[PDB]
Amino acid sequence: GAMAPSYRVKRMDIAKNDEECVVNAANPRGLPGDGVCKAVYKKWPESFKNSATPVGTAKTVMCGTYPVIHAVGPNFSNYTESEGDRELAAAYREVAKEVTRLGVNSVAIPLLSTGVYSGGKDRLTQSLNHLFTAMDSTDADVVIYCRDKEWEKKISEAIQMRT
């Protein structure tokens, strides 16, 4: 584990991360997809061999020795707010189990269900709070990746408020 486990946020492409493993915002079918998923497919295509997994779960596939944890958040266009909230919390709990099993000291993670699976709603606080609920009991350094300048400021404020 990290000596003083922390949370950080960076505004840049997660495919350029400086962590020991990455979480992909995957689709259930293991397809190249869009957004984060397409960037992950271009950087670590080998990790999409048998990466299909249900909504609410995470499945890790190695690219060489680098782990790619495919975490499938719900598409809020298809799920109700209640059931989607439950599946989003579940996907993050599965990411925490995989990060612990892998023994990594750091992990790069995007906010699940905040892009094309958001159903057109701003889900920064919802998704980030479920990330904290799952990752707080782990001792890996967590680095959250985002692309919007206002989201970077809001995620940074939420991290600092708890310290």
Tell me the binding residues for ADP-D-ribose. Answer: 13, 27, 35, 115-117
Give min distance, CB of 84 to Cl ion, in A.
12
Q: Does 13 bind Cl ion (CB under 5 A)?
A: yes
* HSE of 30, CA atoms in CB hemisphere, 13 A: 16
Residue 46 phi/psi, 5° resolution? Answer: -60, -25
Nearest distance from residue 107's CB to Cl ion, in Å?
18
Classify burial at 72, counting beta carbons within 10 Å of its beta carbon; exposed 0-12, middle 13-18, buried 19 or more: buried
- Residue nearer to Cl ion on the CB measure, 8 or 105: 8
Does the footprint of Cl ion cover residue 34 (CB under 5 A)? no
148 binds Cl ion (CB under 5 A): yes
Least gap, CB of 4 to Cl ion (angstroms): 27
Assess 12 for contact with Cl ion (CB under 5 A). yes
Can you give the binding site for Cl ion, defined by CB under 5 A?
A: 12-13, 115, 117, 146-148, 151
